[PDB]
Design a binder for this molecule. Structure first.
Ligand code: CLA
Ligand code: CLA
Ligand code: CLA
Ligand code: CLA
Ligand code: CLA
Ligand code: CLA
Ligand code: CLA
Ligand SMILES: CCCCCCCCCCCCCCCCCC(=O)OC[C@H](CO[C@@H]1O[C@H](CO)[C@H](O)[C@H](O)[C@H]1O)OC(=O)CCCCCCCCCCCCCCCCC
Ligand SMILES: CC1=C(/C=C/C(C)=C/C=C/C(C)=C/C=C/C=C(C)/C=C/C=C(C)/C=C/C2=C(C)CCCC2(C)C)C(C)(C)CCC1
Ligand SMILES: CC1=C(/C=C/C(C)=C/C=C/C(C)=C/C=C/C=C(C)/C=C/C=C(C)/C=C/C2=C(C)CCCC2(C)C)C(C)(C)CCC1
Ligand SMILES: CC1=C(C/C=C(\C)CCC[C@H](C)CCC[C@H](C)CCCC(C)C)C(=O)c2ccccc2C1=O
Ligand code: SF4
Ligand code: SF4
Lengths: 68, 94, 63, 733, 152, 30, 80
């Protein structure tokens, strides 16, 4: 989700969400902003690596504990 | 007797068209003019096949009954008569 | 020549980030050959981090 | 004007390699061609339509000819349940001896391909029994393709070229399409069903040579004109009738029996003929609504202008919508695509529960393939509808001429619609994922009784209302005494109730706690895809981050790194993002259908009912369990007829994995690599005598996104098709 | 009873599942010494399983054909506590949270730099605001009638 | 008969070669 | 070659001229603002589309706009 998409779409969606918030007088002082490009790429690569490594870890440990 | 039913329905529809509903239909048709594109009728915009057939619609009737009205009212009468005949054909009951 | 300093004005420029919002007038330039004399300051920053803007006479309505 | 892109000089001036790519890409976009006008655009569209018709007719002619020539139709019609259909022959120099030995299936003398398209049953039902009929049909369709091409060329000529005012004559086109294209075609198909198909089902061979000397009904046309139409339904086919022979038959040609044929588990042909007759009558009556040259009828603009609510709750109402729709082609394309997508989904949902072809319910692979194919086509069409709506909003919308009508009010309050779509999607996703994870953890800890299972009460009540007595409710048709039961009992209920209350068929299957979560997941997918597409369509003209989006066009890369960075800001990028969600939702739907039906066919329905409530059940009892025969297509010990399916499985995996290249890595790195490679080629000996004509450059951004999306889709489709066909063909049940 | 279901105190698959689980636990219980701590833990597990099954039976649930309880969100009066009774409770609590947050935001809108109060919460004002949400429906209804809920 | 042994090589190799040569010549032609 | 257009909302802060890496823009005297100067883009054929000028422009919306158009050897930035 982070690896494939871009910032402008998320900013434009947050605009409408912020309008819906401001309609009910609950808008924050710290205006929400979409993540920068570099942050998006970093989040994507971090999640990708974590998921792959955890998959391999679980598979290896389960197999070798069960049969070993 | 299909002939009597068909003739009666056609005559009733023709009478209703000619003597009852004529003025309302004529006024409604006059209210909704010819279809327009960009503020101009189809014939004006440059379409030659969309010309109205003024010659056919002219009639010697005192009020203005023409061929198209005859065909439409006869079609409605025939539809009603054939529906009546088909419904009376079977014996279904609720 | 225009709205007084310190007044509150509502924006009518569609392209501005502060459209249909309120802002405070800082100063109005007196030169007749300036197209956008009114200077407005807002509370919130736009996508660029600036917080000041210029406007013409008819794009801002007093409130 | 000189290079290959003759329709655009700007694409011909530049010397890089992107000229070829963008010349191929924008060949069909007639609006951007230089020196273009309305007349040329309309005439080109007309010629393209004719060419497409020719292509379709040639395709079906080729299918018919190949089935006739290399197939076993004659041997199949005798023993439908014990012969595998053959699509066409296989000739391959790369094939080894075991491959030739293993692929020889059916009664052929060489390798063949089993046809899962299902045309055999259709052609058998419509009344074809020998290969001469197929050859005749092939010749006829070849003639139709030829005449289509000839007509296209003729209408591109200067003398027979139509004018723009002819193309915008909406009322006449609507009248002719509603009366001539629809009603008359249905009437002619009813005539064919009465004259050829029904007598061919009772053993009488009616063909062109002798169709004038036979009477479809002994009474003739007398009852139709007299008024006693009931004579056409006096003697229905007996319940012991055998398809294709003259044992236990009748003489009626128009009935309202309902239900399924006992032997073939398909709809009766008389019902189909009656349905077509009624539909044709309705279309013929309804096609006379609109005004034409004869001085009577309706005018569409006056119909639209008159529908404005007093009190101004809708504003100006529908004023000015007629010219907006007529002057723009993308509005028409969007409406047509939306209607076609809904119709395709209807076809996919109906053709599996009420099959109309003989001996098709017993062919499981054909049913699965047809359902999946039609659903994927429907999804793609529905995405295209929103894409063209966004294009219309970018190009053809005139704000001044549509002031305060429904379109302006829609552009006014996009924020509320977007916010509510976001809320609905968030709600559905949160709670569905929560329920699934809770059930999964409860099963993991070893205590299944702590699960959360919710009965779909409303759907079961609907099924009970339809006439199902498997739950306990007694409402409407379920109750013995009711106005509806009494009203409909005398005509169609006796067959419909028997058909619906059996357990073999797929009509209104029993549902439990497992279907609830899957239906909610499907709803979540629909809502999220709709949110993406609607946001892209509504924010096309402008937003707060960039209030002049209409100047740059429908598709443009970005707007630089300023203002925090604006990537994927155009509407093209919204469509490119929504394609993924469309694929995911369609995949969920197809997975659900395939697993439910395979568990039903295999004999036991408890496996699905007990393993569909947690995700490990889907991962273990559906994919892992069913891949056993598919992955064993070829092994070190040998190979069998499933080898090609395993090869295509791996091919789809490879293409899907290759898509990640273009979907992750971006341009600058590759441009630098091309720089270095160009230096290396220029500096080497014996190879600098050869020089390039086009300077090599890396792909653009939008082009790379498109290529990655295409790879993703191709891999997805091929992998799922291979898995589905192989898994359903391995067990044949 | 409803939708062709069986009461959970009458079905047999419930008892069969209970017996299977109890036997599975007792198989592991035999391995250790009867006086050892693992024996006490396994006995506690068995007691918990028996109590859970008895409570589920006594609470009037409905097992299905395969033997598991089924929840009814329909609205029948015999299942008030299945969905409707908990759900209302949730809303109450949920509303509380929302109300409190909204109030706090307004309480910091007056100052010149509310961002400092957003990133560094203050405890006194928040503690004053927290307990005002106990009567959130009444205040919310009064504000809706007055018209101060929606900005203008 | 043996029609496939004659027709498959033509569609597979000769016709694509002719098409590629013609298309490349037309693309690069000024 | 791309198209660079200057609108009248400019205030003459000279930032866009400094930011350009190819020497496209320049400034001319004017009388529509306090600074009495405006921007202009004579050497448009040298523009590479980097959009650095748009990044440094203080205004509610940018007074200098770059629209991408037909590409060529100079605008693509090819060194071979
Ligand atoms: C689309 C149709 C197609 C067809 C019909 C063929 C046909 C053939 N392939 Mg090719 N191939 C194709 C596509 C196709 N290929 C593709 C897409 C790829 C890429 C994966 C390959 C890659 C490939 C490989 C890697 C090999 C073949 C080989 C073969 C030959 C195997 C027959 C045999 O057992 O050898 C019998 C023995 C022979 C050596 C035949 C000798 C006579 C040859 C055909 C030359 C005749 C000369 C003639 C003048 C050619 C010039 C005409 C020009 C227009 C092409 C046969 C000619 C094999 C081969 O021929 O090795 C060189 C082989 O090793 N093919
Ligand atoms: C409509 C689609 C169609 C398709 C997909 C196929 C597909 C096939 N044909 Mg069949 N065929 C068709 C129609 C079609 N055929 C027709 C109309 C005829 C009558 C002439 C034949 C007669 C025929 C013969 C005699 C043979 C095949 C064979 C084959 C196979 C090998 C391919 C090849 O050698 O081409 C051979 C094709 C031809 C000689 C001529 C067909 C070309 C027609 C005239 C036009 C196709 C135009 C196409 C749509 C381009 C449109 C461009 C558009 C996208 C812009 C392959 C399964 C071969 C086979 O048996 O291998 C096992 C073979 O021996 N076909
Ligand atoms: C009454 C005579 C008449 C007829 C027969 C047609 C017929 C047609 N016109 Mg129209 N047209 C007419 C009058 C007529 N027109 C007039 C007077 C005008 C001037 C205003 C036009 C203006 C016009 C234009 C400008 C164009 C057409 C086009 C076309 C073609 C539509 C494309 C297509 O084939 O869809 C197929 C349509 C049908 C079969 C309808 C069925 C659709 C429903 C949803 C079926 C549901 C499916 C059903 C289950 C089938 C089962 C599938 C089967 C495999 C089992 C078709 C030849 C287009 C074209 O193709 O031109 C070449 C086009 O460009 N027409
Ligand atoms: C009913 C017919 C229909 C028609 C007439 C149009 C008409 C139009 N479309 Mg629309 N469209 C449709 C359906 C239709 N569309 C559908 C169903 C979708 C959803 C996918 C879209 C989505 C869409 C987009 C996203 C865009 C258009 C645009 C356009 C315009 C440009 C056409 C062009 O340049 O493409 C020519 C295209 C190609 C030749 C290149 C792409 C080919 C694809 C990627 C091939 C996939 C690879 C292949 C399957 C590989 C197989 C390998 C093998 C192993 C199997 C044209 C006016 C374009 C526009 O900008 O208009 C203003 C635009 O960008 N359309
Ligand atoms: C998203 C929706 C969701 C929902 C509706 C549920 C529903 C439920 N969960 Mg599940 N669960 C979920 C997600 C969800 N879960 C996820 C994501 C996980 C993985 C972390 C789990 C893992 C899980 C576990 C490990 C357990 C449950 C249990 C339960 C039950 C809680 C009973 C309870 O604690 O009441 C007692 C508490 C209260 C009534 C709270 C209200 C009181 C407040 C504090 C105020 C008091 C004063 C005013 C309830 C049926 C428990 C169970 O035993 O179910 C049979 C349990 O053991 N769940
Ligand atoms: C999943 C598939 C996949 C594949 C196949 C590749 C392929 C490759 N990567 Mg990419 N890449 C991928 C995913 C993939 N990548 C992903 C997910 C990322 C993360 C963003 C990257 C990021 C990346 C980087 C950063 C770099 C590459 C580079 C390379 C190239 C290495 C050189 C080489 O081995 O090519 C040789 C070809 C192959 C091994 C592919 C298989 C080809 C086999 C032999 C089939 C050939 C078939 C035959 C010719 C077909 C003809 C028939 C036809 C005419 C019909 C190669 C093009 C490196 C590069 O470009 O430097 C050289 C490099 O710098 N890749
Ligand atoms: C402080 C209270 C608060 C309130 C009253 C609202 C109110 C609303 N939210 Mg918002 N929201 C909040 C915080 C809040 N939000 C936060 C912190 C985030 C970032 C995670 C969001 C992100 C968000 C999204 C993405 C969406 C909404 C939407 C909505 C609307 C529909 C309700 C719903 O869907 O909830 C959604 C709720 C959430 C996803 C999580 C909220 C839970 C937070 C953590 C609780 C508030 C705690 C806060 C720290 C308390 C501090 C006070 C203390 C110091 C005294 C509604 C107007 C939806 C919409 O637009 O409707 C029109 C929608 O799409 N909200
Ligand atoms: C704009 C375009 C407008 C187009 C308008 C077209 C109008 C065409 C009208 C055709 C009407 C045909 C009627 C045929 C019919 O009724 O039976 C015509 C039928 C048809 O005859 C059939 O011929 C077949 C030939 O292979 C077979 O032999 C059939 O068995 C036989 O029934 O003749 C019968 O004997 C059937 C029984 C009819 C009932 C008994 C006769 C009662 C009196 C009928 C009077 C009909 C004519 C009066 C109305 C004329 C209106 C102009
Ligand atoms: C001369 C004259 C007269 C007379 C007139 C008349 C007598 C008329 C008539 C007229 C008529 C008499 C008409 C008619 C018409 C008709 C029609 C127009 C019809 C139609 C039909 C249809 C459309 C049908 C259809 C169908 C079918 C086909 C089948 C079945 C189903 C249905 C039914 C649907 C008078 C004395 C008055 C006066 C003086 C002059
Ligand atoms: C962007 C855009 C667009 C697009 C859009 C779209 C794409 C849409 C879609 C839409 C859709 C897609 C819709 C749908 C709808 C549907 C409906 C509305 C349905 C209904 C139904 C009903 C009503 C039914 C009923 C019933 C039942 C239930 C059963 C039986 C009986 C009865 C029949 C009664 C356009 C082009 C316009 C242009 C502008 C912009
Ligand atoms: C999802 C996504 C976003 C939007 C992501 C956002 C806004 C991150 C949201 C993080 C959390 C969930 C927001 C709330 C964090 C607070 C600390 C919550 C406080 C309250 C309690 C829950 C503690 C981008 O901005 C983006 C930008 C560029 C490329 C890809 C993407 C991208 O994929
Ligand atoms: S950066 Fe903008 S405001 Fe400053 S001189 Fe250039 S165009 Fe004018
Ligand atoms: S886009 Fe870059 S090169 Fe072009 S004018 Fe702006 S700063 Fe100069």
């Amino acid at each position: 989700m982070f690896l494939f998409s871009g910032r402008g779409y998320w900013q434009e969606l947050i605009e409408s969400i912020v309008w819906a918030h401001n309609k009910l007088k609950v808008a924050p002082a710290t205006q929400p902003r979409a993540l920068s490009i570099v942050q998006g790429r970093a989040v994507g690569v971090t999640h990708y690596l974590l998921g792959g490594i955890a998959t391999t870890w679980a598979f290896f440990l389960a197999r070798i504990i069960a049969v070993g | 007797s299909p002939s009597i039913v068909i003739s009666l329905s056609t005559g009733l529809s023709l009478f209703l068209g000619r003597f009852v509903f004529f003025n309302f239909q004529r006024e409604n048709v006059a209210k909704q003019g010819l279809p327009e594109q960009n503020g101009k009728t189809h014939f004006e915009a440059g379409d030659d096949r969309a010309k109205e057939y003024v010659s056919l619609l002219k009639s010697n009737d005192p009020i203005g009954f023409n061929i198209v009205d005859v065909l439409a009212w006869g079609s409605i009468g025939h539809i009603v008569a054939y529906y009546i005949l088909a419904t009376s054909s079977n014996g279904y009951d609720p | 020549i225009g709205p007084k300093r310190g007044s509150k004005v509502k924006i009518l420029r569609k392209e501005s980030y502060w459209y249909k919002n309120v802002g405070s007038v800082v100063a109005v330039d007196q030169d007749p050959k300036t197209r956008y004399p009114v200077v407005v300051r807002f509370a919130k920053v736009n996508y660029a981090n600036i917080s000041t803007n210029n406007y013409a006479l008819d794009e801002v309505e007093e409130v | 004007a000189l290079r290959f892109p003759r329709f655009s000089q700007g694409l011909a001036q530049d010397p890089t390699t992107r000229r070829i790519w963008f010349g191929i890409a924008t060949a069909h976009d007639f609006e951007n061609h230089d020196d273009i006008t309305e007349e040329r655009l309309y005439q080109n569209i007309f010629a393209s339509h004719f060419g497409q018709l020719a292509i379709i007719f040639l395709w079906t002619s080729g299918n018919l000819f190949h089935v006739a020539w290399q197939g076993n139709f004659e041997a199949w019609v005798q023993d439908p349940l014990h012969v595998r259909p053959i699509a066409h022959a296989i000739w391959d120099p790369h094939f080894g001896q075991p491959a030739v030995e293993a692929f020889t299936r059916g009664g052929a003398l060489g390798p063949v391909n089993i046809a899962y398209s299902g045309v055999y049953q259709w052609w058998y039902t419509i009344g074809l029994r020998t290969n001469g009929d197929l050859y005749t049909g092939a010749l006829f369709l070849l003639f139709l393709s030829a005449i289509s091409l000839i007509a296209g060329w003729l209408h591109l000529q200067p003398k027979w070229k139509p004018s723009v005012s002819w193309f915008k004559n909406a009322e006449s086109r609507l009248n002719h399409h509603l009366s001539g294209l629809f009603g008359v075609s249905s009437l002619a198909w009813t005539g064919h069903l009465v004259h050829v198909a029904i007598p061919g089902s009772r053993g009488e061979y009616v063909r062109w040579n002798n169709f004038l000397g036979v009477l479809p009904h002994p009474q003739g046309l007398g009852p139709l004109f007299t008024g006693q139409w009931n004579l056409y339904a006096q003697n229905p086919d007996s319940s012991s009738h055998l398809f294709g022979t003259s044992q236990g038959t009748g003489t009626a040609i128009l009935t309202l029996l309902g239900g399924f044929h006992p032997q073939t588990q398909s709809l009766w042909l008389t019902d189909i003929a009656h349905h077509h007759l009624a539909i044709a009558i309705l279309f013929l009556v309804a096609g006379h609504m609109y005004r034409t040259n004869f001085g009577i009828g309706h005018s569409i603009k006056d119909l639209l202008e008159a529908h404005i609510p007093p009190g101004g709750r809708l504003g100006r109402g529908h004023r000015g919508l007629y010219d907006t729709i007529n002057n723009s082609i993308h509005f028409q394309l969007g409406l047509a695509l939306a209607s076609l997508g809904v119709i395709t989904s209807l076809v996919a949902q109906h053709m599996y529960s009420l099959p109309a072809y003989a001996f098709i319910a017993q062919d499981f692979t054909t049913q699965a393939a047809l359902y999946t194919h039609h659903q994927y086509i429907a999804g793609f069409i529905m995405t295209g509808a929103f894409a063209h709506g966004a294009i219309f909003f970018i190009r053809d919308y005139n704000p001044e001429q549509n002031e305060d009508n429904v379109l302006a009010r829609m552009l006014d309050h996009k924020e509320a619609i977007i916010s509510h779509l976001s809320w609905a999607s968030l709600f559905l996703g949160f709670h569905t994922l929560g329920l699934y994870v809770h059930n999964d953890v409860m099963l993991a800890f070893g205590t299944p009784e702590k699960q959360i299972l919710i009965e779909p009460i409303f759907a079961q009540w609907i099924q009970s209302a339809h006439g199902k007595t498997s739950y306990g409710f007694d409402v409407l048709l379920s109750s013995t005494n009711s106005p509806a039961f009494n009203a409909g009992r005398s005509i169609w209920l006796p067959g419909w109730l028997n058909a619906i209350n059996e357990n073999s068929n797929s009509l209104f299957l029993t549902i439990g706690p497992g279907d609830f979560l899957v239906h909610h997941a499907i709803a979540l997918g629909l809502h999220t895809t709709t949110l993406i597409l609607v946001k892209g369509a509504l924010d096309a003209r402008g937003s707060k981050l960039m209030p002049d989006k209409k100047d740059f066009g429908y598709s443009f890369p970005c707007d630089g790194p300023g203002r925090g960075g604006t990537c994927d800001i155009s509407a093209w990028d919204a469509f490119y993002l929504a394609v993924f969600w469309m694929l995911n939702t369609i995949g969920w739907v197809t997975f659900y259908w395939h697993w439910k039906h395979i568990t039903l066919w295999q004999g036991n329905v408890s496996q699905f009912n007990e393993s569909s409530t947690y995700l490990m059940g889907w991962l273990r009892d559906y994919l892992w369990l069913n891949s056993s025969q598919l992955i064993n297509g070829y092994n070190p010990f040998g190979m069998n007829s499933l080898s090609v399916w395993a090869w295509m499985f791996l091919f789809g995996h490879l293409v899907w994995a290759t898509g990640f290249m273009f979907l992750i890595s971006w341009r600058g790195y590759w441009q630098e690599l091309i720089e270095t490679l160009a230096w290396a080629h220029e500096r080497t000996p014996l190879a600098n005598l050869i020089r390039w004509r086009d300077k090599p450059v890396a792909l653009s951004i939008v082009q790379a996104r498109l290529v990655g999306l295409a790879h993703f889709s191709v891999g997805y489709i091929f992998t799922y098709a291979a898995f589905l066909i192989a898994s359903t063909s391995g067990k044949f049940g | 009873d409803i939708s062709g279901l069986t009461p959970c105190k009458d079905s047999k698959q419930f008892a069969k599942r209970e017996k299977q689980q109890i036997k599975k636990l007792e198989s592991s219980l035999k391995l250790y010494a009867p006086e050892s701590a693992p024996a006490l833990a396994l006995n506690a597990q068995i007691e918990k399983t028996k109590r859970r099954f008895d409570n589920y039976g006594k609470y009037g649930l409905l097992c299905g054909s395969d033997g598991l309880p089924h929840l009814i969100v329909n609205g029948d009066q015999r299942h008030w506590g299945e969905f409707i009774t908990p759900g209302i409770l949730f809303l109450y609590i949920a509303g509380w949270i929302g109300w409190v947050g909204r109030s706090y935001l307004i309480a910091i809108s007056g100052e010149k730099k509310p961002a400092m109060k957003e990133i560094i919460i203050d405890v006194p004002l928040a503690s004053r605001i927290i307990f005002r949400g106990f009567i959130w429906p009444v205040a919310a209804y009064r504000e809706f009638l007055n018209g101060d809920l929606i900005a203008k | 008969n043996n029609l496939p042994s004659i027709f498959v090589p033509l569609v597979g190799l000769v016709f694509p070669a002719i098409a590629m040569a013609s298309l490349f010549l037309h693309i690069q032609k000024n | 070659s791309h198209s660079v257009k200057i609108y009248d909302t400019c205030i003459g802060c000279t930032q866009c001229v400094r930011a350009c890496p190819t020497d496209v823009l320049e400034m001319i005297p004017w009388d529509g603002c306090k600074a009495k100067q405006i921007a202009s883009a004579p050497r448009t054929e040298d523009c590479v589309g980097c959009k650095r000028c748009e990044s440094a422009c203080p205004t509610d919306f940018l007074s200098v706009r770059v629209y991408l158009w037909h590409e060529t050897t100079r605008s693509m930035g090819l060194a071979y």
